[PDB]
């Protein structure tokens, strides 16, 4: 019994370790989000099929590695979905022939937030999966440890909703002026969703964000956002009503706002974060 990956990394007879690099395409669902599907990534075969049958299980101790080390979910294994991390062994899978066969494993994540996410840098570990192989021939009992690494930079949602772009860049026209922001949110089922803004306000009224230009900063003007033509203060919650699978626009627009005093010429830039909550 030996295994190998799609890119050729192999583990010989007796066990060992390997690295699996996969492209992540997470998708949010009603009950639990998807992290990675590991079908067609890992292939295992049996060397003496005519007399030995190998029994393969997902051994206890499998869990999420890397930044995801604190999240729990379920795992699809050979017909059902068991709690993850695995505190107990899973049922058997029989490997029967020399021709390589997949080791289909899929990992899901139980939502814990409203619209949260975690940023996965490329080449970063996500999960560790221990494969245990015994047989019906002798005392062989071996461990194959697979380290799953993200081949690309993605954001894994930790909530029930999702957003169109995790980083949105918009450019203002020259002062005075405004421009809409293309940001939309959706959820897997009808949820009473709302959001609020967080940033370094520069006014007593808490409606103007500080200009943090790195080079040649203009003075006397910040950034102010309007929802449907109305000024939104920073930490005042904004209600969106029921949101379903159809994408619902936030309707945000950025404007120029004077912080008082004379206004000079230069660059303007502000950083604004949007946080969603249940209502």
């Amino acid at each position: 019994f030996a295994c190998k990956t799609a890119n050729g990394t192999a583990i010989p007879i007796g066990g060992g370790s390997a690295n699996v690099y996969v492209n992540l395409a997470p998708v949010v669902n009603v009950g639990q989000n998807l992290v990675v599907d590991l079908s067609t990534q890992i292939f295992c075969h049996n060397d003496y099929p005519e007399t030995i049958t190998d029994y393969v299980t997902l051994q206890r101790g499998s869990a999420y590695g890397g930044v995801l080390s604190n999240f729990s979910g379920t795992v699809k294994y050979s017909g059902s979905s068991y709690p993850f991390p695995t505190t107990s062994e899973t049922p058997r899978v029989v490997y029967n022939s020399r021709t390589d066969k997949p080791w289909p494993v899929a990992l899901y994540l139980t939502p814990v937030s409203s619209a949260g996410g975690v940023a996965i840098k490329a080449g970063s570990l996500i999960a560790v999966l221990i494969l245990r192989q015994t047989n019906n021939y002798n005392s062989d009992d071996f461990q194959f440890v697979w380290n799953i690494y993200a081949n690309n930079d993605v954001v894994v949602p930790t909530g029930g909703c999702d957003v169109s772009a995790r980083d949105v860049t918009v450019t203002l026209p020259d002062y005075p002026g405004s421009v809409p922001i293309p940001l939309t949110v959706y959820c897997a089922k009808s949820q009473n969703l709302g959001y609020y803004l967080s940033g370094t306000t520069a006014d007593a009224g808490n409606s103007i964000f500080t200009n943090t230009a790195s080079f040649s900063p203009a003075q006397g003007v910040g950034v102010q956002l309007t929802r449907n033509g109305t000024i939104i203060p920073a930490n005042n919650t904004v209600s969106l009503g029921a949101v379903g699978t159809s994408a619902v626009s936030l309707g945000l627009t950025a404007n120029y706002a004077r912080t008082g005093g004379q206004v000079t010429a230069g660059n303007v830039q502000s950083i604004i974060g949007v946080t969603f909550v249940y209502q």
Partner: peptide, 12 residues
């Protein structure tokens, strides 16, 4: 901060 929006502008 679920989303971060970078807004740039100039005054001339």
């Amino acid at each position: 901060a679920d989303v971060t929006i970078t807004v740039n502008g100039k005054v001339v």
